Amino acid sequence: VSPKKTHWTAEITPNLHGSEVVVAGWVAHLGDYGRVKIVKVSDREGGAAVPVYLERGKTPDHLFKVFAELSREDVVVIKGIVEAGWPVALDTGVEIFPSEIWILNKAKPLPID
Amino acid sequence: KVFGRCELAAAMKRHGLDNYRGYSLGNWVCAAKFESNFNTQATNRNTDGSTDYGILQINSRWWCNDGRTPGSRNLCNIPCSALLSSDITASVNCAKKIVSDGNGMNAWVAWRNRCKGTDVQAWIRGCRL
């Protein structure tokens, strides 16, 4: 029951503020900082890496458990609301606050050691 | 130790945080105010089994090791207790690694909520730096 992609990551723009989007692509970057955790999604090579913010106090608890199973290069589908209210423009331009994170496949990454 | 505002501004400046990753000094004083109220001993356990430590409330899951958080990464390679010291060197070094991780100061929820996009220079006003 994972939702169909509605937008390409490069189509996530401030104009979409306040609307629901579904993005689909791979995990380009993960940052776990405690109360904030950010997963960036890409769907085009050398393309956008749109940041999906999970913030304690804002994001439902279960999605933090999903974030915990994530790895770089995992293929995901994430449903969320676009936020682009100032001061978002100071850096990222957009943020996505998720309501669903689906993991389609976990990457078989081979540790270097 | 509880720093005074200007006392912290001076220490943070000494430690090379002024414009570190493009963030002016006020951002860092503002972040400490709203994360720890300038208290280097500030310790806050989260419902998720992680704890936040020190003047900038650095988290035990990825950043420092506190011996009790599952899935520990200790990316700063320090024990969490080092972030509780009267001396802010360990917190500053670990903060500089965090702010370089790819999300800038958005790694700090207090900074996002209270500081980002505000007149952060107000936090160092009146100091003589």
DSSP, residue by residue, B82-110: GGGSSSTHHHHHHHHHHHTSSSGGGG-HH
For residue B22, list chain A residues with Cβ-Cβ distance below 8 A: none
Q: Phi first, then psi: give them for residue B107, nearest 5 degrees.
A: -65, -20
A79 and A3 in contact (C-beta within 8 Å)? yes
Nearest to A32 among B52, B62, B112 (CB): B62
Q: Is A39 on the interface with B (CB under 8 A)?
A: no
Per-residue burial over A16-55, b if 16 or more Cβ lie within 10 Å, else e, is beeeebbbbbbbbebbbbbbbbbbbbbbeeeebbbbbbbb
Q: Which of A27, A29, A30, A32 to mutate to test binding with chain B, by most B CBs within 10 Å of its CB?
A: A32
Q: Is the dihedral of CA B12, B16, B17, B18 positive or negative?
A: positive
- Give the separation between CA B121 and CA B29, rounded to whole angstroms: 9
- Give the separation between CA B68 and CA B82, rounded to whole angstroms: 15
- β strands within chain A, DSSP E: 20-32, 36-42, 50-55, 75-83, 95-105
Q: Are strands A75-83 and A20-32 parallel, antiparallel or unpaired?
A: antiparallel
Closest CA to A92 of A81, A103, A102, A83: A83
Measured at the CA of B95, the angle between CA A111 and CA A73, to 5 degrees, comes to 30
Q: What is the resolution of this structure in A?
A: 1.9
Residue A41's domain comprises 1-113
Q: How far apart are the first and last CA of chain A?
A: 37
> Which residues have a Cβ under 8 Å from the Cβ of B117 and sit 6 or more positions away?
A86, A87, A90
Where would I find the H helices in A1-113?
61-67
- Give the separation between CA B26 and CA B40, rounded to whole angstroms: 18
Which residues are paired to B35 by β-bridges? none
Active site residues of B: 35, 52
CA distances from A57 to A6, B21, B83, B107, B110 (A): 27, 27, 25, 15, 12
Nearest to B109 among A56, A86, A87 (CB): A56
Q: Is A57 on the interface with B (CB under 8 A)?
A: yes
- Does the beta-carbon distance from B117 to A86 stay under 8 Å? yes
- Does the beta-carbon distance from A33 to B102 stay under 8 Å? no
- Give the separation between CA A65 and CA A11, rounded to whole angstroms: 28
Q: Is A28 on the interface with B (CB under 8 A)?
A: no
- Minimum distance, in Å, between the CA of residue A87 and any CA atom of chain B: 5
A78 and A98 in contact (C-beta within 8 Å)? yes
3-state secondary structure B34-89: HHHCCECCCEEECCCCCEEECCCCEECCCCCECCCCCCCCCCCCCEHHHHHCCCCH
A31: helix, strand or coil: strand
Query: Strand B58-59's sheet: what is its strand order?
Result: B43-45, B51-53, B58-59
- Give the separation between CA A9 and CA A25, rounded to whole angstroms: 8
Six token digits for residue A35? 């109360």
Q: Is the dihedral of CA B19, B22, B25, B28 positive or negative?
A: negative
Q: Phi first, then psi: give them for residue B38, nearest 5 degrees.
A: 70, 15
Which residues are paired to B20 by β-bridges? B23
> Domains in chain B, start-ordered, CATH in brackets?
1-129 (1.10.530.10)
Six token digits for residue B83? 């972030």
Q: Which amino acid is at A48?
A: A
Q: Is B50 on the interface with A (CB under 8 A)?
A: yes
Asked whether residue B18 is marked as a ligand-binding residue, the answer is no
For the domain that residue A20 is a member of, what is the CATH number?
2.40.50.140
The length of chain A in residues reads 113
Domain count for chain A: 1
Residues 69-128 of B with CB under 8 A from A: 71, 98, 101-104, 106-109, 112, 116-117
